[PDB]
């Protein structure tokens, strides 16, 4: 209710949806537009290893795109510090500000911080046929666990908060992997 002195939100589209390493005062399910979520990023430190990389999500510019996720509000008075913590966790990523549309119609859309991987990033793999991606995911495991666990968790989370049509690429991939 009462206005706050400062505001900063970060949009989570990947693992942040289910697991967060930073403190937050609020969270909301919603979507951003003009980007699409694709498993075109390689993982060598989480869901895969060097020489056997996993596939994880990254955001790609898509004018007709939509990405359903969770926006997290950084703690008031600690936003700048928390951001720094995040900035330091991320190769050549870039941050941008975008409009976040809450699932709840009662809350008005607002600006959020978004972290996006560049082509320049060393782990970027790029597009590949779904069957191949699914295969790579099925066989990959890294310091944080199996790649399949990451895909399934993301799928479960999205499903829990919205219909399956919300993300065709994700659901399709899950199906291909589940076919096993």
Curated annotation (Swiss-Prot):
Positions annotated to bind substrate: 10-15
Domain of life from the UniProt record: Eukaryota
Keyword Transferase found: no
Keyword line: Cytoplasm, Lyase
Catalytic activity: glutathione = L-cysteinylglycine + 5-oxo-L-proline
Catalytic residues in the record: 90 (proton acceptor)
InterPro entries the record matches: ChaC (IPR006840), GGCT-like (IPR013024), GGCT-like_sf (IPR036568)
E.C. no: 4.3.2.7
Cross-referenced Pfam families: ChaC
Subcellular location: Cytoplasm, Cytosol
GO cellular component: cytoplasm; cytosol
Keyword Lyase belongs to the record: yes
Subunit structure, interactors included: Monomer.
Family stated for the protein in its record: Belongs to the gamma-glutamylcyclotransferase family. ChaC subfamily.
Identification of the protein by name: Glutathione-specific gamma-glutamylcyclotransferase 2
Organism: Homo sapiens
Organism classification: Eukaryota, Metazoa, Chordata, Craniata, Vertebrata
Gene that encodes it: CHAC2
């Amino acid at each position: 209710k009462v206005p706050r002195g400062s505001h900063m939100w970060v949009f989570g589209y990947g693992s942040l949806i289910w697991k967060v390493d930073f403190p937050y005062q609020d969270k909301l399910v919603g979507y951003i537009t003009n980007y699409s979520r694709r498993f075109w990023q390689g993982s060598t430190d989480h869901r895969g290893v060097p020489g056997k990389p996993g596939r994880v999500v990254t955001l790609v510019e898509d004018p007709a795109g939509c990405v359903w996720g969770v926006a997290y509000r950084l703690p008031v008075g600690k936003e700048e510090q928390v951001k720094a913590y995040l900035d330091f966790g991320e190769g050549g990523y870039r941050t941008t500000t975008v409009i976040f549309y809450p699932k709840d119609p009662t809350t008005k859309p607002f600006s959020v911080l978004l972290y996006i991987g560049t082509c320049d990033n060393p782990d970027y793999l790029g597009p590949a046929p779904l069957e191949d991606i699914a295969e790579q995911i099925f066989n990959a495991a890294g310091p944080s666990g199996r790649n399949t666990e990451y895909l399934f968790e993301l799928a479960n989370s999205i499903r829990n908060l919205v219909p399956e049509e919300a993300d065709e690429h994700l659901f399709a991939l899950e199906k291909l992997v589940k076919e096993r």
